[PDB]
Structure formats: C-alpha cells, structure tokens
Design a protein around this ligand. Structure first.
Ligand code: ATP
Ligand code: ADP
Ligand code: A1A0O
Lengths: 285, 289
C-alpha cells in the first residue's frame, strides 16, 4: 500500500504518522472554534439553512454534530459561520457505530411523539451552493421529482440548453412511480449531504457535519455515500441490519444518484454531463 | 480584520489561527529513520506533472537564498494512478509576528532578477507549473500583458467555455481583452520570480522567521503575487507595508489588482465551481466600467 511504498522508496524501517470554503480554525478564550467564511451575497441564507439543519439533527440526540454558535454579516458582503471546534479524523474505527446512528436518525421521525407527516423542511437548505425548495409535499416521488430532479434539470436547461437532458427527462419522468409502487415511504430526517468528506470521528465516536437537511426517503441519504465512496463496508452493514434494503433498492439508488450527478453538473460543469445522461439512460433501459 | 470582528463578535482576547490537509492533495507528516518528512498524495493522472512543477518551483526559490521553503525529496508514481510528493517536514504555525519580515523577503525575491546575477529577460518559466490541478503554459514571452492575457486569463476562460459554456463570461472577456493594455500605464515591466500562489494558507512561520510553500512559480509581474494575498486576506497589514517600502505601487496598481484577482477568481471557478461565477463576472464588469 501507500505506507509500504513510502518505506521502500525512502528506505526507512519506521514511518510513524504524526500531526494528523475558506474555513479556518481559531484558538479562542472560551474554547476552540471553527469559522467558515463565504463572501457571496447569499452566504447568510446558506448558513442559516446549515444552522437549521444542525439544530434539527442535534434535537434528535442521535448523532454528534458541531454546535452552531453565530452567523455574522461580513463588511463587503457574505458571512462567517462560527461553530464549536471538533478534533476530527477520517471515519474508520467508528464506521459501524455511525451506520447504527444514521439508521436511528432515519427511524426517529416515525417512531417519536411529534411526527412530521410530509416530505420537505421548514426552511431552505442548500446542497452545496444551490438553494433548494423544501415546500412540504404529501407524496415522496412528487417531492423528489419536482423539488429535486426537475429543479436541477430546469437549471441545466437554462444554463446549458442541453437537448439530450431535456428529451431523457421527458421520458424518465413518467417512469418514476414504477420504482415506488407497493412500498410504504415514511418521511425520515436526513443529513442530506452525507458524502465521505462530511463525516469523521474522534476518540469518543463518529461526527457528521455540513448538513443540508430535509425529510425525505431514508434511502436517498445513502446514494451520495455510495457513489463517491469513502465509507467502510461496516457502515452499510450496520445501517442495513436496522433498515434492510427494501425491494427495488438498486433501481431507486440510480434515481437518487442521478440527482447528485445533476447537482454536480450544475456546480462543476460538463464533466458531470456524461454520468447524468448515462444514469438517465440506465433508468430507461 | 476578521480577527477583530471575531474577537468582538465572540468576546475573546486572543485568537490564533491553527492547523490530511490542503484543497488539492492529501498531506501527511511521517517520522522516519532520517527524520520527519511531509508527503502530498494526488491520485489524478496529472499528479506527477503537478508535483514536478512544484519541485521546479521550490528549487528556483531555494536557489535565490532569500526565502525558506521545504526541500523537495522525491516524486513517486503510485500503483493505480497518481503520485506522492515527499519533501522536508517543517514545524510551522500561522504567519503573525513574522509578517513584516516576509514582506521584506518577498520584495527582495521579486527584485532578485534585476539586482542579482540573474538574467531572465522574458516572462514565463523553463517548465510547466500547475495552477492547482490545471497545467499552465509557461512559454516565454517578451511582453507581460501578452503572456498574462494568453497563458493565464485566456487559458482559464477557454476552460470555462468548455465546461460551463458561459455566454456572459465569453462576451465580457472579448471586451476586457481590448482594455488590457490601457491598465499598464505605459510602464516597462521587469520579469520577477514569483512564488505564484501566495495565499495566506501557503505562508507560515517558525522561531527563525517566515516560511512559504506550495509554489507554482514563473517569471511574471511582481504585482501579480500580491493579488491572491489580498483577496483571501490573512496577511497582517505590516506584510504589505514592508513590501511596498521596497517596491512602491506603480501607477494603475489598483486597476491591475482587479485584473490579477480576476485570474484567481476564474481559477477558483474552474477548481471549485459556480460559487465563483459571480465574483469573476463582477470583476470583469468593474474593469469595464
Ligand atoms: N513541508 C511541510 N511540512 C509540514 N507541514 C506542511 C508542509 N507543507 C505543507 N504543510 C501543511 O500542509 C498543509 C497543506 O499543504 P499544501 O498547501 O502544500 O497542500 P495543497 O493540497 O496543495 O493545498 P492548497 O493548494 O489548497 O494550498 C499546509 O497548510 C500546512 O499546514
Ligand atoms: N466544527 C469543526 N471543527 C473542526 N474542523 C471542522 C469543523 N467543521 C469542518 N471542519 C473541517 O473543515 C473541513 C470542511 O468542512 P465543511 O463543513 O465540509 O466545509 P465546506 O462546506 O466549506 O466544504 C472538514 O473536512 C474538516 O476538516
Ligand atoms: O487551493 C488553492 C487556494 N485556495 C484559496 C481560497 O480557499 C480555497 C482555495 C491553491 O493553493 C491551489 O493551487 C489552486 O489554485 C486551487 O485554488
């Protein structure tokens, strides 16, 4: 592996690791803090959605997230978001614990005393830089098609005028209910952006951060985790011991990954055109 | 400054910036038989080219003897793609007390080509150096505005056209191209060896003085160095005071600062996505106003 190659190339018996958007940590009097800085006009709205997501996750008591402290308007535009600092390392030893916690998080709404009975959220939350509509909907395929897939494809039409995306979406949209028939879908509180880069751990347990939360189908959470990798297998094993894969899981997984590919096309451009269209074609085959 | 706002908003006396790591590569320190090393890993196809550019930049800076940077040690091809770059490990903290000293050293670095036994009378570099992930053309050119428009701004905007097909960026650039020579005020520009990526995250200090690292060097206009230092903050005022005592601002500095910041906004648009479209277009509009 890496370590072995370095030992060989450097000719050393020992090789002992040490030392572990404009985000800077700062030592502070009342304990350490971490400050995220974003200079664009919408930064406050984005950070308030992040605060709202962190607060919703914190209210469950099921997952460890950084405590939000303050959102500060910046002279010259944008905002800083100050939060509790956490010493973190890549998720490894705590992967199975995090799988358990994430499954409990997804079950929390249906199992509690204050049931949220629609898909969506009480405020706007941003997946990356793009604001999302979270308007409450009774029906999950309606919510996902309109306020996730259609929203992304409207931006693609406006900014790229992509004929293939338009034609494939015209065909795919009618097929979506086939992936949901005969199944009970319960709103589940989601982290909303559970890429491997947004999870970590300390000596006590796993930590998750940078949420973009809403009430959705639990399975949507896992799509970004699987597509970009980074999670130990034991994360998924632990998760699916509590929430087993429902029938049709692999086909819905493509639909949910499609959303993430479209969001990456809108964020980063045409490098993501091929996976977006290819995923749509796989769904149509 | 952000520090002052944070001290006020949070009500704290002290506030010291601290701290895998980096936005381009995975960075890790290891103790070894011969001492500590710092290792950067990048899994993309172009990683070797990227690190070889960094090695050439570190070597050029080290040859001046005017600044302290890590010694490059090895570039290693990885099974499965990409490369690892091993370099001297340096115990470091955020730049603070050593900022005025760094301003002096950076001005001396820029002045070295004119005052020392250096003879580079064109802009560019002897090898490819990468802006982050993006390979740059460093073809030598006698004229700096030509080099910068062709091998820095046009290169970034061609990538924006390929990946984003952004009409507004295309149309503003055609207009800005016509304006560029006016921004130079008839000045004779002298080639200066640049670090090339002097944002506050690429400078630091120890008890001997300041340290800089992660260069992407070339012979350019000295002023270009400061643009990224200014736009992302993090340098004490005394860095700039010390620097400009040695190299005063030439006429038109303030407008060229916008041109050079534009390059960095475009590069951040290409690296990090559409969050950087608004400052890129806004900067072009301000220059056209
Ligand atoms: N030689 C070194 N010794 C010790 N620590 C180092 C060394 N070089 C870099 N570091 C640390 O690693 C961090 C990342 O390094 P570097 O900036 O070279 O990486 P990068 O991935 O190219 O980052 P970016 O291009 O976003 O600045 C630095 O901010 C510093 O904290
Ligand atoms: N509360 C925190 N404490 C310490 N480090 C943090 C904290 N939040 C984030 N980080 C560090 O910053 C990195 C990016 O955080 P993230 O919230 O994903 O930022 P962004 O939304 O700008 O990408 C993380 O990978 C982690 O190393
Ligand atoms: O990553 C870099 C600069 N950063 C400054 C503001 O915070 C995020 C990026 C550069 O160091 C790199 O070489 C490349 O240009 C991509 O920026």
């Amino acid at each position: 592996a890496m370590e072995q190659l370095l030992r060989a190339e450097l000719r050393t018996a020992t090789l002992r690791a040490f030392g572990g958007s404009e985000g800077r940590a700062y030592d502070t009097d009342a304990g350490p803090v971490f400050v995220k800085v974003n200079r664009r006009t919408q930064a406050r709205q984005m950070f308030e959605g992040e605060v709202a997501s962190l607060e919703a996750l914190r209210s469950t008591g099921l997952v460890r997230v950084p405590r939000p402290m303050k959102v500060i308007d910046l002279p010259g535009g944008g905002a800083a978001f100050v939060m509790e600092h956490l010493k973190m390392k890549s998720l490894s030893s705590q992967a199975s614990k995090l799988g358990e916690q994430m499954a409990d998080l997804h079950l929390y709404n249906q199992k509690g005393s204050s049931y949220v009975d629609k898909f969506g959220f009480h405020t706007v939350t941003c997946c990356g830089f793009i604001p999302q509509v979270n308007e409450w909907q009774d029906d999950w395929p309606t919510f996902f098609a309109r306020h996730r897939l259609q929203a992304q494809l409207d931006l693609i039409e406006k900014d790229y005028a992509d004929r293939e995306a338009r034609e494939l979406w015209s065909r795919l949209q009618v097929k979506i209910p086939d992936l949901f028939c005969g199944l009970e879908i319960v709103p589940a509180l989601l982290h909303g952006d559970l890429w491997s880069g947004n999870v970590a751990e300390d000596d006590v347990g796993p930590i998750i951060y940078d949420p973009a939360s809403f009430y959705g189908h639990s399975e949507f959470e896992l799509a970004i985790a699987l597509m970009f990798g980074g999670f130990p297998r034991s994360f998924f094993t632990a998760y699916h011991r509590k929430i087993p894969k429902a029938p049709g899981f692999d086909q819905r997984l493509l639909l949910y990954q499609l959303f993430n590919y479209l969001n990456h096309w809108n964020h980063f451009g045409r490098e993501y055109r091929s996976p977006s269209l290819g995923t749509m074609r796989r769904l149509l085959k």
